[PDB]
Design a protein around this ligand. Structure first.
Ligand code: HEM
Ligand code: HEM
Lengths: 442, 442
């Protein structure tokens, strides 16, 4: 019974119920729970996800020690999440030296150099998105953004991760990679059923599939994510490689469409920001000019708009590292086995570092005010050696969509637009009611 | 499904059934399974304890690399065995740096210096054993050795581990440490139920107890094992210390009585060895002289008799280390997660190193022939930094019993003496039928 651990350490927090710990406080959601705890417990508190003790920290230096200084020595891994099956070779799930090999093998694929060779490939789908937007524009009636953006996020993945060009919004039959579409609550209070479903062949990812991917990869041994990984420690195995693109499809999909929905909701409800961004868009790219890699990395107000939306909506919500051994960081003692948690959502909306945190103010990241931001309070992609490996790709993918989207259309709220936006009560950080807006052709 | 691992590595072995692996081959027992496998597969083979892949090695250099060379780097831990409860602080169960601290904290207690301060304390029970033997000697009828030796092994533990002096054979009511008295088969094919019974408070050791020990240890904060540990990295905690003596009581009990039963069975069926040992006993200790520390370490034939019995009956049977990372030792590749097993029983009875291995021949360890023995074939106490930490204590404890036992009595087989001795079909290495012999007063 480790429920007395934090009170044995003099660490405040909510009192854990036997078995459950503090998981019943998730009736408000992961984000609201961390906000309340950050408000009433101070810089550090502890809670129990079932029997698993979790230590939350909000100190920048302590976060720097966890994410960067003592990454390879102590805080190398995240905690296990469920029956992983063969997906234990995924870079986000691999641990210790086995992860170190994967990160070193996959680092070249996400260079700024490889990113520029992909800009024309995904700008092609920045055109396809407008093609499906002009449809729901002269039709003159609101649009569910997660459909067109979800189609866009699906089109870019497939062609960048496999070279398979599709119009996912206009070819819904061909299910090339439909491989994506009350468990994890139980699996947490009951982490002992994780290895049960392992031997049971029960995978959290639909396991009867993959078989289509490895056998369709048999088509690739004999510019995209696949071809960049084949060229390559020892080389990437057949299966090991397959696991990465699956983690790439999961990572590239739900993230792109949800954030793009968050950005467009902010832009529509802040037409001044939308107009100022559209002017910078029109200025840098005169006369609906095609966006390029070097142009995207010049639109300063676009970068500020993206970074501020990710501050309000860090879709990962939390950062977690497992304490591999009894250590003593920045003045306090962390026992082995404790999950160290960094509440990115709570920190991003902390008045100790942000003025009017609920306000969408892109000028926070201006070249005047950007230098005053602590790189460990603002962690939408994490930090350290185990940060978001596809950060530059994700930002470039979303910016290339927003430019072509705003080069042609302006967006306004509707009677159906959920104002204010309510965040999802589940665990992914999406809009409760999906975002619907009016799309006017310029 | 890791059952294709060894055939993917070009490693011979028995074909694993789904779920079960090769555990159905344990109908013969752990020892017979390793003997057959060592006979038909060569130096190295692989099998599956359920889904857990186990690699067996019989090469001395490879054993030296596993037990000694790459102990702290790769092969630091044994594999988990079941729901451990609070017994994860036991030195035999602790892992990595947490074990490194315990071994360094408990190393002084098992010095040859601390052992001499305990010789008079346990020689007192070498007297009590004869006291209960002279009873079943003038009564003139056979004796179940595991009762008097089990009583002896219980008396020495209590007084050395707690200073509590009892005659366990004559005070059976006072259950001071009765804390000792179709699961592990299931727990192996189903290693996923290990953490189930953890949250269920189900401990493999009777958990309602301990409470008598920690609260009776409350009696010790304010020469024995307890007092030697209190004097003491950071110090040993209250609970951490309690877990050690429990592992000490388990380790000191079933081992001492079973081996003493093995020794006396060998001595009775080899009266020449018994007579030659009794002569050396009479010569070094004239006229039933009291044994001392310095005398025990002089009886060369006693040491050879003990070492040869442990060759025929290494009660631990196997040596196991977990492969913590993908490594390449002495020419072959060991993937992370594979349990590396050293069959001590199979190696001790290998004609490649032992002539007439089934024969009890104490002269194998004579100062002429002792030097020809490989320290990694003969591993009754293991080897390397994680060998049997109570080796010198166990040997001294048994030798001190045998001397006083043979200073007064000679032992002969009976009509009930199971000749030849059949080994147990369970998993502890004990006689199938308990050893019963005639005890004659000299
Ligand atoms: C808006 C989009 C995205 C956001 C906000 C985001 C955010 C994050 C965060 C916060 C982490 C944890 C980092 C840490 O704990 O230090 C992470 C990990 C990761 N992300 Fe993303 N991500 C996004 C898109 C992507 C994309 C497009 C890819 C790949 C194509 C990707 C691949 C990964 C991987 C592989 C990891 C695990 C890295 C490791 O374990 O070494 N992510 N991401
Ligand atoms: C005839 C008596 C005994 C025999 C044959 C024996 C044999 C062994 C063997 C083979 C190992 C495994 C070593 C390895 O894997 O390298 C071991 C471990 C161990 N033994 Fe014994 N043992 C005996 C008695 C004892 C006694 C009397 C104690 C304590 C009072 C003890 C305490 C331990 C401990 C704590 C370990 C684990 C060490 C670690 O994990 O670091 N044993 N023993």
């Amino acid at each position: 019974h480790s429920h007395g651990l934090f009170k044995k350490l003099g660490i405040p927090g909510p009192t854990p119920l036997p078995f459950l710990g503090n998981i019943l406080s998730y009736h408000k959601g992961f984000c609201m729970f961390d906000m309340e705890c950050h408000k009433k417990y101070g810089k550090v508190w502890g809670f129990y996800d079932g029997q698993q003790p979790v230590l939350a920290i909000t100190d920048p230096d302590m976060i720097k020690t966890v994410l960067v200084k003592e990454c390879y020595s102590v805080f190398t891994n995240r905690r296990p999440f469920g029956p992983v099956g063969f997906m234990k070779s995924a870079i986000s799930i691999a641990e210790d030296e086995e992860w170190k090999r994967l990160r070193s093998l996959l680092s070249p694929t996400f260079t700024s150099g490889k990113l520029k060779e992909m800009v024309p490939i995904i700008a092609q789908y920045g055109d396809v998105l407008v093609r499906n937007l002009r449809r729901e524009a002269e039709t003159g009636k609101p649009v569910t953004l997660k459909d067109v953006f979800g189609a866009y996020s699906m089109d870019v993945i497939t062609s960048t991760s496999f070279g398979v060009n599709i119009d996912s919004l206009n070819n819904p039959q061909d299910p090339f990679v439909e491989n994506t579409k009350p468990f994890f609550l139980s699996i947490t209070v009951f982490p002992f059923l994780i290895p049960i479903l392992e031997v049971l062949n029960i995978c959290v990812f639909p396991r009867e599939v993959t078989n289509f991917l490895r056998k369709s990869v048999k088509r690739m041994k004999e510019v995209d994510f696949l071809q960049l990984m084949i060229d390559s420690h020892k080389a990437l195995s057949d299966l090991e490689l397959v696991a990465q693109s699956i983690i790439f499809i999961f990572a590239g999909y739900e993230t792109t469409s949800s954030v793009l929905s968050f950005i467009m909701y902010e832009l529509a409800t802040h037409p001044d920001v939308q107009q100022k961004l559209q002017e910078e868009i029109d200025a840098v790219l005169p006369n609906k000019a095609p966006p390029t890699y070097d142009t995207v990395l010049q639109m300063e107000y676009l970068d500020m708009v993206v970074n501020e939306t990710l501050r309000l909506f860090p879709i990962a919500m939390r950062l977690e590292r497992v304490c591999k051994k009894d250590v003593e960081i920045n003045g306090m003692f962390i026992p082995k086995g404790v999950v160290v948690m960094i509440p990115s959502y709570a920190l991003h909306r902390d008045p100790k570092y942000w003025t009017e945190p609920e306000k969408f103010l892109p000028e926070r990241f201006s070249k005047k005010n950007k230098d005053n931001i602590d790189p460990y309070i603002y962690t939408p992609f994490g930090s350290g050696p185990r940060n978001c490996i596809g950060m530059r790709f994700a930002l470039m993918n979303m910016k290339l969509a927003l430019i072509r989207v705003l080069q042609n259309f302006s967006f306004k709220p509707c009677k159906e637009t959920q104002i204010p936006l309510k965040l999802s009560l589940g665990g992914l950080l999406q809009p409760e009611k999906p975002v619907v807006l009016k799309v006017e052709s310029r």
